Subunit: 332 residues, 4 copies
Amino acid sequence: CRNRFVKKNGQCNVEFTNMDDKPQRYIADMFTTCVDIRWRYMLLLFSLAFLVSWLLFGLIFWLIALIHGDLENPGGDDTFKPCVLQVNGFVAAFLFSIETQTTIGYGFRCVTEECPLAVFMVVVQSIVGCIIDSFMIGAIMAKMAAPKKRAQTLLFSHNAVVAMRDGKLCLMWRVGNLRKSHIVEAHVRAQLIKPRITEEGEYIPLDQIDIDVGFDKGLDRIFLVSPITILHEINEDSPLFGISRQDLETDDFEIVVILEGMVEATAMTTQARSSYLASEILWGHRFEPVLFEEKNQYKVDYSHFHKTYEVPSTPRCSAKDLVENKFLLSNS
Amino acid sequence: CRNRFVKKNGQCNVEFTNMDDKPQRYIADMFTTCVDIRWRYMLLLFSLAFLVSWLLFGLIFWLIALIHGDLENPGGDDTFKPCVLQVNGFVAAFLFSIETQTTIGYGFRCVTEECPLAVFMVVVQSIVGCIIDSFMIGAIMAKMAAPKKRAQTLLFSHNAVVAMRDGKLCLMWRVGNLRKSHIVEAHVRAQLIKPRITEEGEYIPLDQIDIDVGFDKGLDRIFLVSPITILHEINEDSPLFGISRQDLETDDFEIVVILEGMVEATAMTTQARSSYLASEILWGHRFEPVLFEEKNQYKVDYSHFHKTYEVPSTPRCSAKDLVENKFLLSNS
Amino acid sequence: CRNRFVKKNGQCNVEFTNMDDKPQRYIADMFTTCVDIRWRYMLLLFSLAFLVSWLLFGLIFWLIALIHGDLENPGGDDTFKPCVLQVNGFVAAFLFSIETQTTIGYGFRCVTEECPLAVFMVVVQSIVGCIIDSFMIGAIMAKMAAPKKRAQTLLFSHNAVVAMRDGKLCLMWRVGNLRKSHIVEAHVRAQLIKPRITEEGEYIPLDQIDIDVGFDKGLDRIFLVSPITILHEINEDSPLFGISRQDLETDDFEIVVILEGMVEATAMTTQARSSYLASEILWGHRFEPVLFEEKNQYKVDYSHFHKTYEVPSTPRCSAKDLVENKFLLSNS
Amino acid sequence: CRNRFVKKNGQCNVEFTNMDDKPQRYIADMFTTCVDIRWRYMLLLFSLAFLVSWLLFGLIFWLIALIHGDLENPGGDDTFKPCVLQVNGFVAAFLFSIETQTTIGYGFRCVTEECPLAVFMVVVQSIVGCIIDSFMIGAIMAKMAAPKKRAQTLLFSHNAVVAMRDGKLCLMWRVGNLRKSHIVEAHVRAQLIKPRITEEGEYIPLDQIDIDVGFDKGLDRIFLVSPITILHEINEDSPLFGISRQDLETDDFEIVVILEGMVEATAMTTQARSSYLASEILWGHRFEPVLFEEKNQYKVDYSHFHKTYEVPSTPRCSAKDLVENKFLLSNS
Ligand SMILES: [K+]
Ligand SMILES: [K+]
Ligand SMILES: [K+]
Ligand SMILES: [K+]
Ligand SMILES: [K+]
Ligand SMILES: [K+]
């Protein structure tokens, strides 16, 4: 009922305000800023840069022609040589500027040996043109390769389940790869999200509490080919230790799940996220198997991926009740 | 007898089906998609992009010439100036389009100061041409650098062995580097693959069970120069604890081995994989040494890399038998 | 009073001297060297490279024209063909050199089929031009993407605090993200900086002593959306164990804080640093909450980020006193 | 006396032989292969690629001119239009090929609307030219950024020392950064190298034995500004446990030291290595302090970096002797 901290699609539900220094901080960070904005704005920006330098040098060449007197004698003659042939006005200056910087160089408008300043300006513009190109190439390459997109070929089950596995009460959710290309050095994490008040009365608007997926033993590291069911064994140290099936219909909390790993092709790290609300957690359920063997290989049927079935033999009490009860029986 | 989950060459043996959303998910992920397809398709795609934009602008310039009336007066005269010189029809329009976007700019077909729209279109096409170039460069750079190729200069022994080392029964396989360039931050993992039924009757089509290579102590991290023999000591926590030489000819299971690390030049992570079936594991064997010293250095003879010899003194029972037996003797 | 090892802005306060081999070591490392210098020097260097090769080949073409005799017959005639058309002197040679290497290729100055050496030199310069371009592109891309800039969209609280949380005395500082884009695989570290003398009398000018943020349990790994308060519980192993509120006004030491993680877009690791002097640590204080819920989402108010309030119930003695005192009471 | 496995400069002392499949394995890995070879070979290879495609298309255009009959009428007339203007023979064909692929496009030799095949070939060559460019750019960028070069601005002390620190016998060596730019996520490892025979008689030509630098506690992770002394406390689990000052003049072994971390600018991982022979380890010595404070900052004097002084109070026995002796005294 409270609210969702992280959407099922991985998107975070918080917005920032009253940030103070953001513009100056975004300028020092401008590259990050630049690759974060939408494609259409990034490109708009670069085409502006091209446009602006074309106009600028165009203006320079125009001025040079003006003062040198080339406007009235564009192609020269035996007695007169222009700084740049065929610049008759501003459009021509602009065209020349475009043809030089882009290195198209049609040649109708062309530099001559006449004016050291025009030759100089052609040197500057060629360099400046390489610089801008380099920036545009860099930004495009970067933004293109963005690894977070890989998270959309990665999959979490719509639900998480609670069931007995190997004698232990466990929280389980399913991750899968939608591509035949690997997630290298993949590993999982999970957190329980909810506000709480400490014993000193300090109010924590949202506390983030680890959910042990096997980090200490290195079992958080998975080799992901066909879908894996991720397991949190609920025990003395689990924030879920004292929670039973009925506490699930009542309580308001959220479990954030994460899967990190490197996109095989680029070895770049992507982070895939989802979330399970208390109401999205199915007590006493098990995931339908997606994997099966055929003659020469194994196949994953992905239409069973989200599916679960009831296991009525599942205990309805907390792992705490389960432990303590075990010790009334074992104790008498 | 069951089947192989991972081929000796590292290739995974599973195929995906009934995937639902794949096309839309592959489009949001399109870059990953694009660098995953074969070189010939990726290139085909880019040349299509070039072709398509050339044709398109060619078409534009053609239309402009048409309406302006340049088709009937390609080179102009004292009284008439075309939007783009020498466009006499569609081929010429197309050529002009190619020469502008590629920045070849022969110049026979050439823009004039006459039509703001033609000049404008030359501005747009130059920008658009830089964008496409940038994409092609990005994709090629990425696909070219793909780190998984490095896995083919990395090597696993064809067999794994079981032998006593330093008083402990151990599973061993050999990894090696085929290049004089390093694998940075290299480390190993192994898993035992097989289906199993839990005590609650839940059927796991393939369970992946860690094989402890030294993670807790950090001994999973290796410095790989000449071939290292990787060691799994079989003990109370080893899934192999209760397995003896005869259980090996009988049982059906598989051990997946992994070696991850960064290609020295690019510091990109590669994952190298292989697999040992129960029948590919040699009980009571040891690897032939590949390393030997000469006057000023050490040399690795790689023709001994896969070779093993029998060690008949090796115990034929399980590490479990071995432990418990030790405590009948030590116990009486 | 001593001095600050790391500035609040993350900048390190040490300078190096008497380095010996620096120039030769910087040359072998030249790329790193090159991307470390300021933008204006890096660019100055590349434009020098362009300039130098233009001049050089310009010189070559000039010499070729000279000896071949093209200077006196620039455009040739029925009886004579120049090596490169229209090179009348050095400026023209230079222009030709620029037009070829940049691939502008106006065409007024143009290579002919006449001299194998001129054609050859055009081949060499085209290649050489691609090489230099490639270097400039590489350097610019790299320097542009530098991940340390991301650290300026990351934030530490101006102060650190000491307060009871969940029955334990803790040192706390606050980190936050100023962007809606993630820090992937983020984690924290902290060190206590100060000189000390060992029991053998060895003087360590500055010793760096770990401050346990949860590494053993993996709690150093944070998922950072809205600001997290980082917690050091002061206990038997904490270098702060024996320090009380009064020891804070007296002692001279420093706590260096670090947050590392990958910029989402580029998956490149950035390191963000700050520092708290003893005098910058507020005993008996708690951070003002920045996070609050509204109808459909959560919002962070960043104007409360640095703010703290007094918690007068906080004990003023050391965690050591606190422990030992607990055992006089529990002991009688 | 035996031999050095890793040189002081980090270079590994082993060579590989009898490798079998190397060529085919190097071809699948060709990119890695290509960025590993020397600059002069890599460039030679690309200029070959340029040369080869220029020649090839040059040949095509020549053939086209030949059959079409352009060789005898290079510039055409009112009644005849060539496929490509001004191709009079092979040199001209070659020039045209160069001018098109490089996009120089002088324009004297120029495509016409006449032959669909010539136009087609201009399309193919433009694309092919972009592809090759892209490869060359990729390879150069990669090879340029190689992170291992960073290891030459990183430094190990020429010697390692053995001395008491804080009541414990420790092996110590010194690492330092020669740049004002950081090594991000830096950490250390060390190994003891030597051949040995197991209790089963198995001969290990060189065994690599971990030297505990603090991995379990996370103290292997260092924040490196001014030089750090790395510490191996010699204890029950140290392979050096039973080694005393005299065992050092006698025994033959080697300690390999490693420092890994990401180059700040590129966030690429570099590995820096060195080695200490038994004879390069100084028993009863301490490093001279390089760090000192001045008015507004700290400075590192790098001329003291390798220097050590004698500490005559250092015990000359093994950590084993030291422990056991402690328990004869404490025991009576
Ligand atoms: K031209
Ligand atoms: K890159
Ligand atoms: K541990
Ligand atoms: K060009
Ligand atoms: K051109
Ligand atoms: K041109």
